[PDB]
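quick one, five chains, predict together pls
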Amino acid sequence: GPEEITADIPNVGEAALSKLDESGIVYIGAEVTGGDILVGKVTPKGETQLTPEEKLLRAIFGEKASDVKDSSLRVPNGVSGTVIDVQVFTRDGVEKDKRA
Amino acid sequence: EFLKPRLVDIEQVSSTHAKVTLEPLERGFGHTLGNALRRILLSSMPGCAVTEVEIDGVLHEYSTKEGVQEDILEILLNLKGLAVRVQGKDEVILTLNKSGIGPVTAADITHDGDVEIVKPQHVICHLTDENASISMRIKVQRGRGYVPASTRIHSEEDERPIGRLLVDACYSPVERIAYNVEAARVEQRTDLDKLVIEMETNGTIDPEEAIRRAATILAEQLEAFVDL
Amino acid sequence: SVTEFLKPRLVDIEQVSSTHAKVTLEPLERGFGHTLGNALRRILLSSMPGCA
Amino acid sequence: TKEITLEAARYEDESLNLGDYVEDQIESVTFDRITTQTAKQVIVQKVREAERAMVVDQFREHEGEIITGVV
Amino acid sequence: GVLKIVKVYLAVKRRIQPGDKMAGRHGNKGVISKINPIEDMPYDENGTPV
């Protein structure tokens, strides 16, 4: 499967999602600090296993993505910054999201 | 058997800098009091400069507005040098509104009773477009010394509305301090040194109060030298 | 604030037999060490009453 | 929205007395998309609770297993 | 083999601090050593510190 650019990133709290919109792209003019997340990128993992917990979680809820891995472009450590300009380049085969 | 120095003259040649004269001072103290008072005055005084701002229609420091002929970074750099004096409170907010052709000055800032601007002729930014305007509200708080902008984020009081801008704090009312000694009057004696201190104030601090506060600081911190 | 300070706490007074005392104080706010040292050195070395 | 009394219900004629724990509201549907990690943690906790419930159903009801075993 | 590429521009304001390599216009290099407060500076008889 392809990659996901949305803001659905697990194992993080409200502090990491506060810098992100409903589309997974950081705001224009947010004072970020080294160690935060700019663009929420999650990679789908393979099934590779079969457990009753799978049928309990993804089958019942319908969330058949179903496994995700954190691969967000985090800010390199040691540097602060202020996001002044964000560019979105999309090939004309994929339906662009709301922020695009 | 010493002679207590007393303030005798405050020569205010202009609204920005003045001279204070001390009268009889014993020999050898011309360089003790002068250097100590110079260092205290230049180091530790309560300033009243700007800390934080928020523009009507910009998202960060590095963008630009339509109508102003210089960058938001330039307006912040010019604004960080504003000389404003607060009397009643210790943290106050002032508002600015201006439209039409013509530069905006500190005299165009709302001037509610407690707050008093000292240099109305100071320029902040020009205005060129006819149907353009800026509505900035500004933050002035007390303090002393020097506070870098990086440390200002440590508050962690949810200071993340994107419309806020932090400017480098520079509140330190004195700018250039000089002193010199000379032979005093007769007083039926000799070997008394008068201390003359020339002080260059940005405009928010009167000389006599500055000298009194510096002496109070020195005495309060030196009172610890009463050993076991 | 405006007038809050860091009043020094005399940590110790090391004393050699009878004359070579070594007074150390801590903390002292930045810029005050040289000022106080200069003031004390000039007021103690130069002018203080004493018979000779 | 989650704690009221008869004094506030007096506007609505106080149909129910204060302190009632019965159901008084409902939700249409929850997306449960961003909360996937929390749902997985809750599923793990529920699996542990089900294991504990099975243990209570078998060993506790049978007073444990009084027999030789392997540690 | 790409769907979308997103580029963001971070903008830092680098201040001065001990370690910054400074120089004049011919020869006299130097690493800045200490941010000495202004009171300790050697001052001219007019009052302006260096």
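Chains C and A do not touch (no CB pair under 8 Å).
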